[PDB]
Amino acid sequence: LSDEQMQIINSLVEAHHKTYDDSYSDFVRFRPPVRRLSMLPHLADLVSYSIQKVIGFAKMIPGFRDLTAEDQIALLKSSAIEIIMLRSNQSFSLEDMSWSCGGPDFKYCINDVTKAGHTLELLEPLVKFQVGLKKLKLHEEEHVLLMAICLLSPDRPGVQDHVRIEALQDRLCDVLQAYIRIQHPGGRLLYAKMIQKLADLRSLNEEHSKQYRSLSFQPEHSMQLTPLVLEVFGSE
Amino acid sequence: LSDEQMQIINSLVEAHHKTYDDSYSDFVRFRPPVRRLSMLPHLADLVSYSIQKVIGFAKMIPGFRDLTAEDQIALLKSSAIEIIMLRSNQSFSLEDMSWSCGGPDFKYCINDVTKAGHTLELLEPLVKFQVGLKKLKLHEEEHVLLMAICLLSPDRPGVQDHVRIEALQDRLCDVLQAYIRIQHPGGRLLYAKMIQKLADLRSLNEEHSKQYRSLSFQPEHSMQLTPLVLEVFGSE
């Protein structure tokens, strides 16, 4: 690993630590969980909160701030749910097959999201994705690189500078390939698995967009969302 | 009091009981109070919740449902904050000079709204209004009639059928005048005081709209509002 590759890793890890709270102490400020669509208010606040964190993380990705505000938004909107899916793996547990975020109130199973407007058609591959990603047992350096690579994908709707973004992602994919080779024993096949995860996220992204569209078209449900959520997942 | 005047009173009282919970048990579902603009999330959820209740109340006001959807919206948008001000008097206490809504968490003083984006320029006449209105010691029949009269005011922006709405309000003002004369001892001067309260609400409405506009123009603050709140107090 070169010095530049090292600086990139350092800054990305620091960016994640500054935008991911391991105590989940902010969750008490969300609309509380209720166990129709009783879980939608809590989920909406959680997702809205997470979007703000993803934005914070993205702004510290090297090269992202130099992009056009339009490109930044285009990348953010299209990849938001994928980054949320990726970052949520940190709270996911193989023992409980659930997201454990501090207290008993914030221990989320698959049934909770069902009570929030989404179906098993999304949640079944989601949990399967979470299990597979957890089994990869990523270093924090790798998990953090994966989120940055995902966010800087040039193949998103609305992007204008495809070459400048593909270059940034390549430079990031380079770092990831090098790190695994030098710092991760028995990771000879790990990189290919991680790229496959990015492909999994596209299908999950697609299914979420369909189910979100179903949800956002009903005013009684869309009124439970936050302005930020409506703006990020909206078609405007 | 005639039978028709009596039926109107009955239906309005029942409408209020169905849309005003004396236990305030729903308040636990709001984003919790935090004691910048730390109180804005709780206030936003409280106001949003109250708007839904005001809508429920309005739909049961005799003649309101027969109005145009546009007129219903025009009346609702322009008078929403005034009805909220009126209905909040039920939780207001002269002992504490505050709104007491169940537990210690939901005991709101003037400083709480200050921590929610509004200034003393609105709150000082508001509390003064609350004190004066409480001192009138309205019967439930009167307090309920006042909200209905306020809501059916023809002198609002965006209204189209001024004659049909003024007629409904007149018919309501008739009921109020009769009720006070027949059912309220020493209320010889009460009706004039209540009409003066409607005039007070206009000034309070005006000041709120200015301070809301200041708040809604800042995305970091407007993102803390609810879709319903944005829609009702919005200029669209």
Binding site: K59, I73, L76, E231 | -
Partner: peptide, 9 residues
């Protein structure tokens, strides 16, 4: 996208 634009400074 007024919120996003604000959050992106």
């Amino acid at each position: 996208h007024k919120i996003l634009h604000r959050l992106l400074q």
